Amino acid sequence: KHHFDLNESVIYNNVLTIFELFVTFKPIAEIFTKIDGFFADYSCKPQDFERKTILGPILSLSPIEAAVAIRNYGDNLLRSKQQTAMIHESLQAEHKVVIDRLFFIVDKLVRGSLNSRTDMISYFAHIANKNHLRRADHPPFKELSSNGFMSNITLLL
Amino acid sequence: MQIFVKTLTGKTITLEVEPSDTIENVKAKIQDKEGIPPDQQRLIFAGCQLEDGRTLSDYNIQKESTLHLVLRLRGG
Amino acid sequence: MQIFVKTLTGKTITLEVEPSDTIENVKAKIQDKEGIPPDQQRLIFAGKQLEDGRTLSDYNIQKESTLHLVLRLRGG
Amino acid sequence: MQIFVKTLTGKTITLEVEPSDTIENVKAKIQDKEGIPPDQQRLIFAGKQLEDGRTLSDYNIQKESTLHLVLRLRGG
Amino acid sequence: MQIFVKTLTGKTITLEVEPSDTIENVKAKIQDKEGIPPDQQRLIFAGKQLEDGRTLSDYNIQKESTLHLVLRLRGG
Amino acid sequence: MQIFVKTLTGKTITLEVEPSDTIENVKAKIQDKEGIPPDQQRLIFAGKQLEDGRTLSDYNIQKESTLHLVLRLRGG
Amino acid sequence: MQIFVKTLTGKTITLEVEPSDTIENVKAKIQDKEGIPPDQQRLIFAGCQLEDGRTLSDYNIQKESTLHLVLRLRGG
Amino acid sequence: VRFSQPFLDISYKKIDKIDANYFNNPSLFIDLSGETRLNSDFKEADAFYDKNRKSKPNFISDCFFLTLTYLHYGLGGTLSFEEKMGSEIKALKEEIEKVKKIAANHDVFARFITAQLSKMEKALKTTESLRFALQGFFAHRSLQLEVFDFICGAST
Amino acid sequence: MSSSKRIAKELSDLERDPPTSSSAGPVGDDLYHWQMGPADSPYAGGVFFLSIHFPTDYPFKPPKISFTTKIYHPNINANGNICLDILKDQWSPALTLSKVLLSISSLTDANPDDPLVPEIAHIYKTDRPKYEATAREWTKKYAV
């Protein structure tokens, strides 16, 4: 409540660092996986895994988000190959940085504890099996998880 | 047994079917795997349409046969 | 009236009829063993066609004359 | 002595039980709320299926032992 | 004073109580006279579920009246 | 079993029955004259109800006992 | 004979109907006078809906009776 | 409607000019399909057509009834047609602040949204124009006076 | 002049002979404002709260009755309307409130020709298993 996109380069870095301190401590990791709001609802809306769980607000960051691209490439609609390649080479480095930063999270998350790694596997699997509608010719995009999110988690795991 | 079907874009979603099952019976197993209401369920086999109420064994559709999930002028 | 009938592969049955009966009633002694639906009631007689709806006096079914039963695959 | 069991979609549930309860009895205590066919009984403890004929006692089931309700076994 | 309490089986028991007694007291008497747990007990009078914190005089319960007792809970 | 029947206005018919029959079979001799559909098969017997689906041994139809046939106006 | 029906705005379009005619039979005489496809044809009489296949004489709708052309949450 | 007032004279002398038996024969120019009747059914209507079994052409009588027919199917339809317009004006204004109460802080989606209400304010000014224009010519007392004169004469 | 004298006796008939699976009487103090799912039915485990308002002509008119507990039945909507053919066709003056409660207890047997909720009526027509499952679902949901 208080549009968590990748535009505000002075927010998401702080949000990531907020988890960065917790993830370091081994006693924190072994029990971080069993908290309130970690799992989403049992019958949660597929488009509601974005804003109704723990991780969903932090790893959903990806350049594919509509407004970021509207601001960058939609500003200069008739840009040539080099002009858009400028946006690419500008944003891909930030993308690589965030990917590596949150992989550091998930590594200790898996290396938290036995129940921790079981919980993370279950948490991914549950989001997966509720997205089979993605493979249709005209899938219900408004009823499915944003492809930025389900694509980010792919090369992450 | 199992049979095949393909859309315009080339995707090949298989689905188990039974000789007793009618065309609407199999089309009921379509929106589950593609999210398509049967109001637009349009089936062509061997260039000929299929009757709505008729059963699977009404078109001699053997095992490992082929369907063609085509669409009418509906949607959009 | 004993009229023989044989399928494509060579299997045959022994069935009884009456001279003034109908081919569907003769067919009614074809679904007694296998249970062949009337929609597939195909009769072949020496390069011609025998419609199901007519009678035995119109099909000139003689004594111990073998007819041809072939599974119908209608549709078009 | 109630036990927990989770489905493929993960519906946590409770069911009071006894050491002598047979596995099929436990399954019969499931379709009350889930409406599952008991013939497709498939219960998973410690990565093992539960021998339906036996009871819970031959398994080292303890207080609030977790189970997995994976009984699709489909089908269609 | 004596009143009538009916369980789900239709079993009628006469309970000799006083109007000043609370419904909790009545449920304790029921558990003493049959062993049935009081948390499962659901008393019905003229289509009204009663409260253990309240007494018989509160709901105009006269003697020789009929009370319907309802049980619940199962094997999970 | 001669059982009389009379409608609201006082018109009556003379019909035959058997002691082991069913009320719908008794009704089958009620649509012989008017052609009354079975959906309107209403029987009235001394302030009670007589469902159509039962038999004459359950309706205790005595000898020359008049029943009541009233047009049904169901709906709701 | 002729019967009545009214919309939400109060207009009273009459239309001849026949006792044999079904509810869809009369509703087929609706889009002609108001241009409403029977997909939304919703009829209420005396607060009770009418079954689709049911005929006119299935609701004792006498001459000079009243219908109520109401609409569902469809259209727009 | 102008052809009516001569035979609808305030002296009321041309009453016999319009035949009251004009609906004895079947129609000649006006439609009766779906034409509900006053206190008779089609079953009596078709029989009574024949029951007379005989037809003198006259423009006047045809024009008189065509006048009422166009009255009902015409501006009679128009008044109800605009009867929902006043509700439609409130409906259009209902979303006017609904799409403005949102955070309008986009780069080009904001420009598209502003173009989405640049036409909407013209739409409001047009719906209000229609609502305040249909009302005035209804308030054109001369025209309505003529119409009401025709109503009175036809009733007579 | 005539109205009240029937209600008191029809009510005291409860004390004279209590019913099997029901209980009646005034909901509060009003005379005209009066207040158990069958085992062989998915309603089992359900006991119901009822709203009753006798009309001024109750001895000569059927009393309208409403539900307070939601149910899943074809002949019942959310407004508790009862498709009892007695009340609107042959609600004789001699029919007791107890007899009316008995006819209600007959609702159990569903009438398919009176599809107050046709969505549930077709399910009763072919989908009895899920019908009985959902009836118990709502039984445990509302009619505790």
Curated annotation (Swiss-Prot), chain A:
Gene that this sequence comes from: UFD2
Note: Present with 2600 molecules/cell in log phase SD medium.
Residues of the full protein shown: 161 to 319 of 961
Family: Belongs to the ubiquitin conjugation factor E4 family.
Localization per record: Cytoplasm; Nucleus
Domain notes: The U-box domain is required for the ubiquitin protein ligase activity.
Subunit structure: Interacts with CDC48. Interacts with the ubiquitin-like domain of RAD23 and DSK2. Interacts with PEX29.
Name recorded for this polypeptide: E4 ubiquitin-protein ligase UFD2
Source domain of life: Eukaryota
Function: E4 ubiquitin chain-elongation enzyme specifically involved in polyubiquitin chain assembly. Binds to CDC48 and elongates mono- and diubiquitinated ERAD substrates presented by the UFD1-NPL4-CDC48/p97 (UNC) AAA ATPase complex to a chain length of 4 to 6 ubiquitin moieties. Delivers these polyubiquitinated substrates to RAD23 and DSK2, which target them to the proteasome. Has E3 ubiquitin-protein ligase activity, accepting ubiquitin from its cognate E2 ubiquitin-conjugating enzyme UBC4. Enhances ubiquitination at 'Lys-48', but not at 'Lys-29' of the Ub moiety.
From Swiss-Prot, chains B, G:
(Microbial infection) ADP-ribosylthreonine sites (modified residues): T66
Cross-link (Glycyl lysine isopeptide (Lys-Gly) (interchain with G-Cter in ubiquitin)): K6, K11, K27, K29, K33, C48, K63
Modified residues (ADP-ribosylglycine): G76
UniProt-annotated location(s): Cytoplasm; Nucleus; Mitochondrion outer membrane
Site positions for Interacts with activating enzyme: R54, R72
Essential for function (site feature) positions: H68
Effect of H68G: Loss of DTX3L-mediated polyubiquitination of histone H3 and H4
Domain Ubiquitin-like: 1-76
Outcome (variant: I44D): Impairs ubiquitination by CRL2(KLHDC3) E3 ligase complex. Impairs ubiquitination by CRL2(KLHDC3) E3 ligase complex
Mode of membrane association: Peripheral membrane protein
Post-translational modification: Phosphorylated at Ser-65 by PINK1 during mitophagy. Phosphorylated ubiquitin specifically binds and activates parkin (PRKN), triggering mitophagy. Phosphorylation does not affect E1-mediated E2 charging of ubiquitin but affects discharging of E2 enzymes to form polyubiquitin chains. It also affects deubiquitination by deubiquitinase enzymes such as USP30.
Resulting phenotype, S65E: Phosphomimetic mutant that binds and activates PRKN
Modification Phosphoserine, positions: S65
Outcome of mutating N60R: Decreases affinity for UBE2R2 in CRL2(FEM1C)-UBE2R2 complex
Crosslink position(s): Glycyl lysine isopeptide (Gly-Lys) (interchain with K-? in acceptor proteins): G76
Result after altering R74G: No effect on ADP-ribosylation
Coiled-coil residue windows: none
Function recorded in the entry: Exists either covalently attached to another protein, or free (unanchored). When covalently bound, it is conjugated to target proteins via an isopeptide bond either as a monomer (monoubiquitin), a polymer linked via different Lys residues of the ubiquitin (polyubiquitin chains) or a linear polymer linked via the initiator Met of the ubiquitin (linear polyubiquitin chains).
Protein name in the entry: Ubiquitin
Source organism of the structure: Homo sapiens
Parent-protein start and end of this portion: 1 to 76 of 685
From Swiss-Prot, chains C, D, E, F:
Post-translational modifications reported in the UniProt record: Phosphorylated at Ser-65 by PINK1 during mitophagy. Phosphorylated ubiquitin specifically binds and activates parkin (PRKN), triggering mitophagy. Phosphorylation does not affect E1-mediated E2 charging of ubiquitin but affects discharging of E2 enzymes to form polyubiquitin chains. It also affects deubiquitination by deubiquitinase enzymes such as USP30. Mono-ADP-ribosylated at the C-terminus by PARP9, a component of the PPAR9-DTX3L complex. ADP-ribosylation requires processing by E1 and E2 enzymes and prevents ubiquitin conjugation to substrates such as histones.
Disulfide bonds: none
(Microbial infection) ADP-ribosylthreonine modified-residue sites: T66
Protein function: Exists either covalently attached to another protein, or free (unanchored). When covalently bound, it is conjugated to target proteins via an isopeptide bond either as a monomer (monoubiquitin), a polymer linked via different Lys residues of the ubiquitin (polyubiquitin chains) or a linear polymer linked via the initiator Met of the ubiquitin (linear polyubiquitin chains).
Residues joined by cross-link Glycyl lysine isopeptide (Gly-Lys) (interchain with K-? in acceptor proteins): G76
Phenotype for S65A: Prevents phosphorylation in case of mitophagy. Impaired translocation of PRKN to mitochondria
Record site: Essential for function: H68
All residue ranges annotated as the Ubiquitin-like domain in the record: 1-76
Domain of life: Eukaryota
Transmembrane segments: none
Site (Interacts with activating enzyme): R54, R72
Outcome of substituting S65D: Phosphomimetic mutant that binds and activates PRKN
Cellular localization per UniProt: Cytoplasm; Nucleus
Protein name: Ubiquitin
Name of the gene encoding the protein in the UniProt record: RPS27A
Modification ADP-ribosylglycine occurs at: G76
Glycyl lysine isopeptide (Lys-Gly) (interchain with G-Cter in ubiquitin) cross-link site: K6, K11, K27, K29, K33, K48, K63
Phosphoserine carried by residues: S65
Curated annotation (Swiss-Prot), chain I:
Annotated family: Belongs to the ubiquitin-conjugating enzyme family.
Active site: C83 (glycyl thioester intermediate)
Protein name: Ubiquitin-conjugating enzyme E2 4
Species the sequence originates in: Saccharomyces cerevisiae (strain ATCC 204508 / S288c)
Region of interest (Disordered), ranges: 1-22
Induction: By heat shock and cadmium.
EC number: 2.3.2.23
Modified residues (Phosphoserine): S12
Note: Present with 13500 molecules/cell in log phase SD medium.
Basic and acidic residues bias (residue ranges): 7-18
Function statement: E2 ubiquitin-conjugating enzyme that catalyzes the covalent attachment of ubiquitin to other proteins. Mediates the selective degradation of short-lived and abnormal proteins. Mediates ubiquitination of PEX5.
Highest taxon listed in the record's lineage: Eukaryota
Phenotype seen when the gene is deleted: Defective activation of the ribosome quality control (RQC) pathway.
GO BP field: cellular response to heat; cytoplasm protein quality control by the ubiquitin-proteasome system; mitochondria-associated ubiquitin-dependent protein catabolic process; protein polyubiquitination; rescue of stalled ribosome; ribosome-associated ubiquitin-dependent protein catabolic process; ubiquitin-dependent protein catabolic process; ubiquitin-dependent protein catabolic process via the multivesicular body sorting pathway
Keyword line: ATP-binding, Isopeptide bond, Nucleotide-binding, Phosphoprotein, Stress response, Transferase, Ubl conjugation, Ubl conjugation pathway
